[PDB]
Amino acid sequence: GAMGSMERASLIQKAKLAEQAERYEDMAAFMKGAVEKGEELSCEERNLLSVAYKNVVGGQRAAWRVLSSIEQKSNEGPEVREYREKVETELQGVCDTVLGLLDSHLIKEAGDAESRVFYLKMKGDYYRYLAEVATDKKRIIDSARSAYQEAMDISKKEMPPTNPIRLGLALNFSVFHYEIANSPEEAISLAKTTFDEAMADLHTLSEDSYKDSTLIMQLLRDNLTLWT
Amino acid sequence: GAMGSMERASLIQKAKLAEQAERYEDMAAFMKGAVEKGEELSCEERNLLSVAYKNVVGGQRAAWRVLSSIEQKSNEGPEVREYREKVETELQGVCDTVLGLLDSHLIKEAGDAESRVFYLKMKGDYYRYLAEVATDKKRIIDSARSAYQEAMDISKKEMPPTNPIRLGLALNFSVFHYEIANSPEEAISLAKTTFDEAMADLHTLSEDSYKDSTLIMQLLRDNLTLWT
Amino acid sequence: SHSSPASL
Amino acid sequence: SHSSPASL
Ligand SMILES: Oc1ccc(Oc2ncc(Cl)cc2Cl)cc1
Ligand SMILES: Oc1ccc(Oc2ncc(Cl)cc2Cl)cc1
Ligand SMILES: [Cl-]
Ligand SMILES: [Cl-]
Ligand SMILES: [Mg+2]
Ligand SMILES: [Mg+2]
Ligand SMILES: [Mg+2]
Ligand SMILES: [Mg+2]
């Protein structure tokens, strides 16, 4: 790996610099290098990994949607299809890279609920991103569902209802149901029960944790407004 | 070149698609491929070339400024310097690429005022971007000045005072004076005379050309407000 | 639909 | 300082 010669601590430091500079491709490459040092990641480092790749794939998803819309309108030369395929293939490459890091060997070494749920959620997320462009589609959807479901089972057993990782997992699984799996009723049910159960646990939290939890609860609410 | 196998028209089409998708690195690579077909560029194509590379280097300049500020504060490990150097080197690579396209062989084949001034302005711009990070600095500054000056001489002889290319050239040369050459008085003088001369030529223009010219005149005004 | 922020 | 837009 091109980052194999750099110290782990230097890679983490440079990932934080890249974030400040909004250089998310660099940030992802630094965090990939840190993962490949073989040590488990701290909570802070897991978040840096997620921030980096979510911004990279986020730009690719936005571009893919633009090009796909143009392509569908053109079907109401090969260039539009070719360029959409180019972006699609790069997007799939990033998703495969993240999934590879999770499988080699972040998930298998993650024993604590906070890390294991975080990584399984990520696995569901990047299979969901693959599903968005798939037309293998059924198997990709099943892989996302399976990862989300294992994460959900652990989170309900091991985390309080207001835990931001648990909340963000439930949010994304509900989006999976609504956008990917053609299950809007499952999506609404999951979002509502998650919101209500979190509401009832807010009283246990400090001011800072309260802010973290309610931020994600507002996203659940906004989706329920959009879906109903 | 990786684009050598693609039709010129397809490269132009895909540059426009990349622009719509805000994929400016792709856009620049497509336009580089179009330039390397060897034909002169149309007015529209020159603008696509500029849009693409200006957005690429714009992101690099913004990142460089973030990292340089952090580096200067740290001087009130080597990682900050190393990563700033990494971004700096990529920025210089993009500038060298653009300058190479202008020298091989866009400028020498450009005979019309609109194309020749556009390309010489671009040459000044990308030497100016090199000058922003240089510490060779004097020679880079002289190269920017020389390019801007040839463009200015042609533009005053061949273009009306409201021509948007002439105005954008004068704007950028004034920024060169103020930010690069430590000549704020030259910058103010150039901006004011350019603004006043354009004002007096607006009466000749259609509604659409009037809008194009006054947009750039407002940038000259905004700089004069900042500089005085 | 809104999905989760990256940092949790 | 403001500089020129790319498209002119
Ligand atoms: O049976 C149901 C009843 C109401 C409902 O809608 C919402 N529930 C909670 C919130 Cl926060 C926002 C909304 Cl719009 C969804 C299902
Ligand atoms: O001698 C001078 C007189 C005024 C001046 O300032 C401006 N001139 C024109 C505009 Cl549009 C805006 C300004 Cl702030 C600059 C030089
Ligand atoms: Cl392509
Ligand atoms: Cl580096
Ligand atoms: Mg070491
Ligand atoms: Mg129903
Ligand atoms: Mg041909
Ligand atoms: Mg004075």
Inter-CA distances, B114 with A75, B16, B212, D3, Å: 38, 22, 15, 19
Determine whether the shortest distance from the Cβ of A228 to ligand 1 is under 6 A. yes
Q: Rounded to the nearest 5 degrees, what angle is found at the Cα of B173, between the Cα atoms of B169 and B179?
A: 140
Q: Is the CB of A224 under 6 A from ligand 1?
A: yes
One-letter amino acid for residue A169 of the chain: L
- Closest by CA position to D8, among listed A144, A2, B219: B219
Element (H, E) at A24: helix A24-35
Ligand 2 probe mutation, B178, B189, B228, most atoms within 8 A of CB: B228
Nearest CA to ligand 1 atom 4: A192
**Residue from A150, A128, A152 nearest A140 by CA:** A128
Contact A183, A207 (CB under 8 A): no
Helix (H, G, I), strand (E, B) or coil at B149: helix
Please state the atom number of ligand 2 nearest to the C-alpha of residue B225.
Answer: 14
Pocket of ligand 2 contains residue B228 by CB under 6 Å: yes
Closest residue by Cα to residue B164 from B127, B223, B224, B121: B121
Burial A76-113 (b: 16+ CB within 10 A, else e): eeebbeebbebbbebbbebbebbbebbeeebbeebeeb
Experimental method: X-ray
CB D5 within 8 A of CB B213: no
Cis preceding-peptide flag for B105 (omega within 30 of 0): yes
Report in angstroms the alpha-carbon separations of A12 from A181, A192, B80, B84, B86: 37, 38, 12, 15, 16
| Residue B111 to residue B154: CA distance in whole angstroms | 11
Return the number of other C-beta atoms located less than 10 Å from residue A32's C-beta. 21
Whether B220 and B170 have beta carbons less than 8 Å apart is answered as: yes
Closest CA to A201 of A217, A188, A185: A217
**Residue B22: partners with Cβ closer than 8 Å, 6 or more residues away:** A59, A62, A63, A66
Tally of CB atoms within 10 A around B44: 11
Q: What's the token pair of residue B17? A: 């698609």
Inter-chain touch C4–A168, beta carbons under 8 Å: yes
Could you give all domains of chain A from N- to C-terminal order, each with its CATH number? Answer: 1-228 (1.20.190.20)
At A159, is the secondary structure helix, strand, or coil? coil
Ligand 2, atom nearest to B220 Cα: 11
This PDB structure is determined at a resolution in Å of: 1.8
| CA gap C7, B202 in Å, rounded | 53
Interface of B with A in 6-65 (CB under 8 A): 10, 13-14, 17-18, 20-23, 26, 59, 62-63
Give, using CA atoms, the residue closest to atom 2 of ligand 1: A192
Distance from CA of B42 to the nearest CA of A (A): 21
Give the C-alpha distances (Å, rounded to integers) separating B45 from A27, A64, A151, A157, B32.
Answer: 33, 24, 51, 60, 11
